[PDB]
Structures are given as C-alpha cells and as structure tokens.
C-alpha cells in the first residue's frame, strides 16, 4: 500500500481556458444546428454559463463573427441558434470583468426503485416532481420535515 | 507399438481392389474409377454403393475424379471406424475362410500381443488381409498365423511401420 507514487515531474497542468471557451462555444453552436441540443435542454443553459465564466474580448469577437455570419434562412435550427447567439453576446458583454461564478442549473433528481412483472430490480434517478431548481432545493432543505 | 486409426486412402484402396479380385499393388490410385472398369456399367455403380455405405457421404461425380483426391475428401468427415461394409467383409473373410478354431476377436488379440499392434493397426492389417485373399483352401491355424505375419509386413511396408 505504502509505495511512493508521487513525483513533481509527473504533475499535469491545465491553464489554457482562453482556447477551450471558443471550442466549447463552437461545439454548442453546431450541437444546436444539428438538432442535438434544443431550446428545452438544461445543458444549453449549463454550457452558456460555462462560456460566460470565460468571457474576454477575443471570445466576444469570435461570437460576434459566428452569430453575424449565421444564416437564419437555411433552417429553423439556424434561426434558433442565431437568436440564442445575440442573446449570449449580450450576456457575455454584461459579465465582462465580473468574477466567474459556479452556477448549477442541473435538474434535481430523487431515487426511484421499480420492480417489473419478472422481478428485475431497477434503480433510476427520476426528476423530483416538486423541486425542479436548486433554489427550490434550498427551500425544501430549509423547511425540513 | 503406438495405435493409428485407419485412413480413408487405404480403406478406399482395399474396397476398390477387393471388388475387382485384384492385388492391392495391381490397382494404381492415380486413375479415375471409370478408367478401372469402363468395360462394365454395373461394377462401377456397385463400387460407388459400397464406398457410399462404408463412408456415408460421397462427392458429386466420384467416378471421373481419380482416387487420390477422393481419399482426403472422405478423410476429413470420416473418423477411423470399420463402419458397416468392411465389418461384413472381415466377417465373411473370417467365416467363409478356414480359421475354424479362432474367430475375428482372437485374430485381434493375436496381432495385438504377439506383434504389439493395437485396434487402429489391427483394422489396417485386416485391410491388407482382405486385398490378398487366399481364396483356395488353407490347411489350419499354422497357415493363418504365417499369413497374419506376412499381412503385418505388407501393412508395415506400405504405411511405413517397423516391428
């Protein structure tokens, strides 16, 4: 158990967010266009938040270019991504030189145990009927039982 | 001495040579079945029938494809059993001829002990004895043992065995 595995040289350093932002945005862009992330997926919000937490002038001009060049005439998806585009550009202009924030929007899920006719035990993380945001989650947590 | 289950090449050669009443060396493998007995039409078909019984499945157009390639075409599916045809043929060999004292079962353990050749090497020597049929009357068991010695020499020479 007590074999020394740590070494300074092996250390890996990731610090290059400035590129990753643009990647993450262009992946998002395409994901919306190719009917992967629709206007009813939380992951759109999540990824918008992650992008905003990397805002700078280089990212802003990269959005500006890509969203301006987009052609909403091509398809419904193009219009949708183009609208979310200008919206994101406004958002990431507003939060420029703001401290990037941890912001969880993930659908709170409770546990479910199911038994089919054959008796196959199934565990699923089913979205909570009542709690549907972290805000509400905190409220439920405050109110106790 | 180590045993070896009988091949489809020897069992094919002894079946074809026996039906002809010819020596095992008079009949060359590298020849079509149609070249052998093209003279007569019946003999060709009763050759195919007896080969069909012993080995079960036969290829399409056997008679025009020579014996050697047929040997391995039976060999892959066949599994070193005396089958049905050769079982009746060795039974008529022992019963029709005059080893009045000893039957097939005594013939097996005589080769097996006095030489040292087990089951698969017994079948192989019995196929030598079938192609070299004495035909004429033999005296007694003293001729039969001397014949079984000589048939063990021929098996050993053709296959490439030593005793």
């Amino acid at each position: 158990g007590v074999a020394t595995s740590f070494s300074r040289k092996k250390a890996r350093t990731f610090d290059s967010s400035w590129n990753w932002a643009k990647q993450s945005l262009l992946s998002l862009y395409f994901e919306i266009i190719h009917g992967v992330l629709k206007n009813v997926d939380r992951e759109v919000v999540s990824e918008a938040i992650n992008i905003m937490n990397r805002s700078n002038d280089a990212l802003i001009k990269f959005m500006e270019y890509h969203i301006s060049n987009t052609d909403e005439t091509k398809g419904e998806n193009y219009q949708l991504v183009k609208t979310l585009g200008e919206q994101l550009i406004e958002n990431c202009k507003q939060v420029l030189d703001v401290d990037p924030v941890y912001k969880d929007v993930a659908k709170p899920t409770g546990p479910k145990t199911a038994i089919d006719k054959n008796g196959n035990i199934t565990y699923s993380e089913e979205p909570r009927e009542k709690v549907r945001k972290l805000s509400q989650y905190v409220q439920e947590m405050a109110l106790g039982g | 001495i180590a045993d070896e289950p009988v091949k489809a090449s020897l069992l094919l050669h002894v079946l074809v040579a026996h039906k002809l009443k010819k020596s095992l060396d008079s009949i060359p493998m590298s020849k079509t079945i149609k070249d052998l007995v093209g003279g007569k039409s019946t003999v060709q078909n009763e050759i195919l029938g007896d080969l069909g019984k012993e080995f079960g499945t036969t290829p399409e157009k056997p008679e025009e494809t020579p014996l050697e390639e047929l040997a391995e075409t039976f060999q892959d599916t066949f599994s070193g059993a005396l089958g049905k045809q050769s079982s009746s043929l060795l039974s008529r060999l022992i019963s029709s001829k005059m080893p009045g004292g000893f039957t097939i079962t005594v013939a097996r353990k005589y080769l097996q002990t006095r030489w040292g050749l087990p089951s698969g090497r017994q079948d192989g020597v019995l196929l030598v004895a079938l192609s070299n049929e004495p035909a004429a009357r033999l005296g007694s068991e003293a001729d039969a043992k001397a014949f079984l010695d000589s048939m063990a020499q021929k098996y050993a020479s053709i296959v490439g065995v030593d005793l």
Partner: protein
C-alpha cells in the same frame, strides 16, 4: 419410366385398367417421398390389384433406402 411412371395417378390408372405398370423410383429422392406416392397409388387402385417398383441401378444412393 422417369418421369411418366413416377405419377401415382398414372400408375393407379394403368393398374385399375387391368394391366401391370411399375412405380418408377427414379423421380423420388426420399423414403417418405416414395411412401406418400405408394399410399396415393394404394388409395386409388381397387382391392387385390398389383403394381411394381422400378429402381435405377446407376443411382446407388437411391437403392440404399429404396
């Protein structure tokens, strides 16, 4: 005759006609293949009527079940 005298119907017609015909084995491949034909002949003929079977001696694989 193959295939004229393979037909159970034709054989039956000739046998009821007060004449000898033989059911040709040449136009069958299976034991039940012959049997179903023969039971078709039997059904069609009249009681105490007789017919033969013709087996081709160039087809040993037909003989071995025939």
């Amino acid at each position: 005759m193959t295939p004229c005298t393979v037909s159970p119907d034709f054989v039956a017609a000739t046998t009821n006609a007060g004449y000898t015909i033989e059911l040709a084995g040449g136009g069958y491949f299976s034991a039940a293949g012959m049997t179903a034909a023969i039971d078709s002949v039997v059904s069609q003929i009249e009681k105490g009527s007789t017919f033969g079977i013709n087996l081709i001696y160039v087809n040993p694989f037909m003989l071995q079940w025939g």
